[PDB]
Amino acid sequence: GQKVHPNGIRLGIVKPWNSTWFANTKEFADNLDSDFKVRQYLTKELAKASVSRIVIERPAKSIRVTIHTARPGIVIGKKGEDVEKLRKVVADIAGVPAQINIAEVRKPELDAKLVADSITSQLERRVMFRRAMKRAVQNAMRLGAKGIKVEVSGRLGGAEIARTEWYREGRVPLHTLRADIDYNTSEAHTTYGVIGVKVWIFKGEILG
Amino acid sequence: NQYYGTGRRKSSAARVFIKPGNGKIVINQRSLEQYFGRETARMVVRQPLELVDMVEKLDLYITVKGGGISGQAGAIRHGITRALMEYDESLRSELRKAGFVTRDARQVERKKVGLRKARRRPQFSKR
Amino acid sequence: RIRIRLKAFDHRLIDQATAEIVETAKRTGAQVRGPIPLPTRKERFTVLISPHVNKDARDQYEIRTHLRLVDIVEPTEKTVDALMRLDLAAGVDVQISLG
Amino acid sequence: PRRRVIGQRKILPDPKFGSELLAKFVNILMVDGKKSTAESIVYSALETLAQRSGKSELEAFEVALENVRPTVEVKSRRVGGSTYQVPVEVRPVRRNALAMRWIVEAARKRGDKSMALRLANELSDAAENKGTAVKKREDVHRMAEANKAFA
Amino acid sequence: AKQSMKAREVKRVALADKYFAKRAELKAIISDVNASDEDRWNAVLKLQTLPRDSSPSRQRNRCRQTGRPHGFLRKFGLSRIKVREAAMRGEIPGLKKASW
Amino acid sequence: PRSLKKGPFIDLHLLKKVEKAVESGDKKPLRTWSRRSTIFPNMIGLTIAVHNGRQHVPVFVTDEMVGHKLGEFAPTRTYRGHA
RNA sequence: AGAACCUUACCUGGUCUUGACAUCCACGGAAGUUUUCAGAGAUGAGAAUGUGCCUUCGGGAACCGUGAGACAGGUGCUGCAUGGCUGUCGUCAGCUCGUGUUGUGAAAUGUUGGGUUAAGUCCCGCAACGAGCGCAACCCUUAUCCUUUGUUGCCAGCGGUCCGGCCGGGAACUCAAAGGAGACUGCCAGUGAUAAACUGGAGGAAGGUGGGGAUGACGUCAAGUCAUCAUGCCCUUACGACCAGGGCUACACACGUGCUACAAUGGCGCAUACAAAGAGAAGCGACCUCGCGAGAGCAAGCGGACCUCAUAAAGUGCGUCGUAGUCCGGAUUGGAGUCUGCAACUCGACUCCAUGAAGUCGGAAUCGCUAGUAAUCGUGGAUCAGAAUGCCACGGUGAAUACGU
């Protein structure tokens, strides 16, 4: 298990946190669980909607969620119809007043998590994993990524002996802390087993 | 009129102040002999003064916190030297020569996972 | 006198919050004491990172809880009352206490 | 080491007499980082020795040292099938230290009661050219002499 | 861990919640030196009568996600493994890798 | 051992049983699992077959046995010898 | 990162079978609350209360009850089907690619060569020209300074004093964070190929990567983990579920890792000094009173730079013991007890009194460590009702040696 997690190592400098709130040792674990629950719910709901990042943020006994999704209107549906429904169940999950915001993701080809999800979907519907991977890399590059790497592992093409294959293009510095490396992961539950997909996308270096 | 120098060594933080006088040293409202039972500590606190013959010429009031004894004494000496520097500014060279101006940055190395100490590896065995 | 205890994990955020409360205070009232930094609480944690067994394999996290003590010497009518409507940025637990 | 030689670290002279050699000796004597006790022991011995032999404290200690310093030691080269001990001229810094270490080992070995007293007896013996440290010194010399053919 | 174990624990927690007042009162009675001997005996027997799962010292802290008994942490309510995942993924606020 | 202020320990049901046997004046062995139960004065004379994990082993009570517990007289492990 | 129960996955018995855990209807009952006997308990039988959100009244959503099945459940097997995570060589300086060129080709070149570097580090050359992942830097921390802000932190100079920063106060100093400065072979000399560098010195708190951490390239070991989790055959009135007791603590033995020792650089007794870093509400618990003591009683202060844990120990001074299996050493066993806890038999910790094994520095052999390191001394934390000599942290004192390959 060689490598460090690219988000995790950068949370202090170039990457921010997802859950963004304060408490006392009393109420932490409870809120962590609440976050887990809501996030799980939202993943379940907005699977067909391309959602990248749920950001929970709870001030003053009221939870504010922010959903970063590529196509809002499917999450929104009719104006203020679907969002509202989501809000009440979120409140229930938490046990507090809920407030949902929806951030619209520009360039879903450059968002690593979305790409991984797409690749997973492709794998599920029985395409050539290699071709999916090339599509991913190529699209990202077209869109203006300074670099991208993707990796897929296990039971590729239903083969008995599992193996991993990866495709890099551009430059993807991981040891460099100040580099904006959006990393994410997904899993394809195929007939032959799980296939793990990692993707790194290098949006460039920050100077501060 | 009193001149001043901060002293710092392992986890000790001395506050040395220099005044003109006869040469009586007070450390936390105690004499040098009272506070430092160890001779080595007495020596190290005095050293800068021996180097530049200003032992009888000036009194000094000190208050020191943190660390043990030897580290406290070193911090005191550092504060003394700083206060000498501030006071004369023509004594810098000999203090440099002696090695007093230098802050001894040696802190204790933290304990590291895997290891029993900073560097002591647990007992190895092939079998 | 109103002591105010700002607590947060992010230090830039807490600083921003300290500033903002200070402004709120200063316009209405007079003689804001000041934004005194108390010690930070660095709560550390060690964990085994292997799923099953590798004991020397470990990760050491921490949470840096930052404290800011802001004080108001003269509570006027307008000043204390401002704060009620002036909520701060999230992830910053404030704690006011008069007297 | 392979790559770089390094400069020896700074050592402070002892408070009582203001000397580097004595400080080194006390360091050698010490155990478990317990300096104050070891240097008290060293001082006690020194005082007893001074009483016994007259001369200054320091001077007597130096004399005793002189009598256990080695001119030559031996090291194992072993280029051949069997091993060959080869004499080598031991440098000023090292020889002094060796004599110290040798005195201290003798003190450890002796049968007297207090550590300081034992050290004192050892120093007296070295001055007189008996004891343990002088014997070991002799043995070192003797080995070198035997292997003088190698050079 | 299994579902069954999680269920058992939930039950135990419920029971602790239920019988806290009574059990605490009984403990107090038993402790109270300024009290009758027979009363003390009644109290200890009564404690015996109450259910065993009522005790707080029966319940084991598990991971709130996996139910793993070992490797637990209190602040987060999670086992080491899931906690680490949380730190990496950004969902624990304030937590980041520490070096000094 | 248990605190003096707490008193001795005996399982309630076992105590009950003992009381009944006393009332009856019968000497039929009482099978019991309460190995942790202390032994009392009134139980002297009774046979009480204590569980040892596997089976109930009869224990005829004696005056000497009072302060002890029932499990002390019902060894659980069965080691004969290594050869 | 903590087996008395629990945990537990194991054994023995006692029990259940759409089920402890979910969804689904049908239809019986508001959920729930209190209490009774038998039972080791699991469970199996009794007495009191309620009817809330709405009905062209064939009833509903929460929460119990019964039967059918669809299903639940599995810490069951396969890590040699897998994902994820982890170790490892190894923080070793390497591993590659594109285009070009050489070769029938596998391939080669680049990436070799002269120097140099911690470094595939840098320069110079050269059928190579370029690029990427890595060796570096960006991050944390530590070492010097400055600015800002001064309480719960500080007391230099002022007044008062109960001689306590405690109280007027002061914002200096320490300290606390926030933001800046600072180190780059930048400056000097020499050597060097008109170089990259190296050797020395100046300044400086710091000098040549300043010290430490995080950071682990392509890959290797069908390395580990299906018992965290997820995931692609088997069990389903039992390989599932509930209970009480037992076991995981067994004991001719062998090995691993530690602690304590064998003593006088010490033991014991009396006095006495100097830390850091943490934790704390089903919590830390002062003071005072009682207890030889573990503790008990009463009970402030405190979600805490404020109060508590909380006396640092080694040390220093004075006395004693005088080389003894000892005033060394504490195992072991007997008595009596304290606390946690339904519960200390199996099987907790600690206390008091007694008891006082082996052991006098350890065969072959074998491990660690280059500096605030080793060695030694204490302190804290996690898990945690209780239960560390382990683990993870913190400071105290503080060496030896490096000729060299």
Swiss-Prot record, chain A:
KH type-2 domain: residues covered: 38-106
GO molecular function: mRNA binding; rRNA binding; structural constituent of ribosome
Pfam families: KH_2 (PF07650), Ribosomal_S3_C (PF00189)
Assembly and interaction partners: Part of the 30S ribosomal subunit. Forms a tight complex with proteins S10 and S14.
Entry function: Binds the lower part of the 30S subunit head. Binds mRNA in the 70S ribosome, positioning it for translation.
Family: Belongs to the universal ribosomal protein uS3 family.
Protein name per Swiss-Prot or TrEMBL: Small ribosomal subunit protein uS3
Source organism per UniProt: Escherichia coli O45:K1 (strain S88 / ExPEC)
UniProtKB/Swiss-Prot annotation, chain C:
Keyword annotations of the record: Ribonucleoprotein, Ribosomal protein, Ribosome biogenesis, RNA-binding, Transcription, Transcription antitermination, Transcription regulation
Biological-process GO terms, alphabetical: cytoplasmic translation; regulation of DNA-templated transcription elongation; ribosome biogenesis; transcription antitermination
PROSITE patterns named in the record: RIBOSOMAL_S10 (PS00361)
UniProt KW tRNA processing keyword: no
GO MF terms held by the record: structural constituent of ribosome; transcription antitermination factor activity, RNA binding; tRNA binding
GTP-binding keyword on record: no
One cellular component (GO) term of this entry: cytoplasm
Domain of life of the organism encoding this protein: Bacteria
UniProt xrefs under Pfam families: Ribosomal_S10 (PF00338)
Family classification: Belongs to the universal ribosomal protein uS10 family.
Complex formation: Part of the 30S ribosomal subunit. Can also form a heterodimer with the transcription antitermination protein NusB. Binding of S10 to NusB is mutually exclusive with its incorporation into the ribosome. The rRNA transcription and antitermination complex (rrnTAC) consists of RNAP, NusA, NusB, NusE (this protein), NusG, SubB, ribosomal protein S4, DNA and precursor rRNA; S4 is more flexible than other subunits.
Role of this protein: Involved in the binding of tRNA to the ribosomes. Part of the processive rRNA transcription and antitermination complex (rrnTAC). The complex forms an RNA-chaperone ring around the RNA exit tunnel of RNA polymerase (RNAP). It supports rapid transcription and antitermination of rRNA operons, cotranscriptional rRNA folding, and annealing of distal rRNA regions to allow correct ribosome biogenesis. In complex with NusB is involved in the regulation of ribosomal RNA (rRNA) biosynthesis by transcriptional antitermination.
Name used for this protein in its record: Small ribosomal subunit protein uS10
Name of the coding gene: rpsJ
Curated annotation (Swiss-Prot), chain D:
GO CC term, one of those recorded: cytosol
GO biological process: cytoplasmic translation; negative regulation of translation; ribosomal small subunit assembly; translation
Residues of the full protein shown: 2 to 152 of 179
Additional note from the record: The strain K12 sequence is shown.
Subunit-level organization: Part of the 30S ribosomal subunit. Contacts proteins S9 and S11. Cross-links to IF3 and the P and E site tRNAs.
UniProt gene name: rpsG
KW Ribonucleoprotein (keyword) present: yes
Domain of life: Bacteria
Protein name per the record: Small ribosomal subunit protein uS7
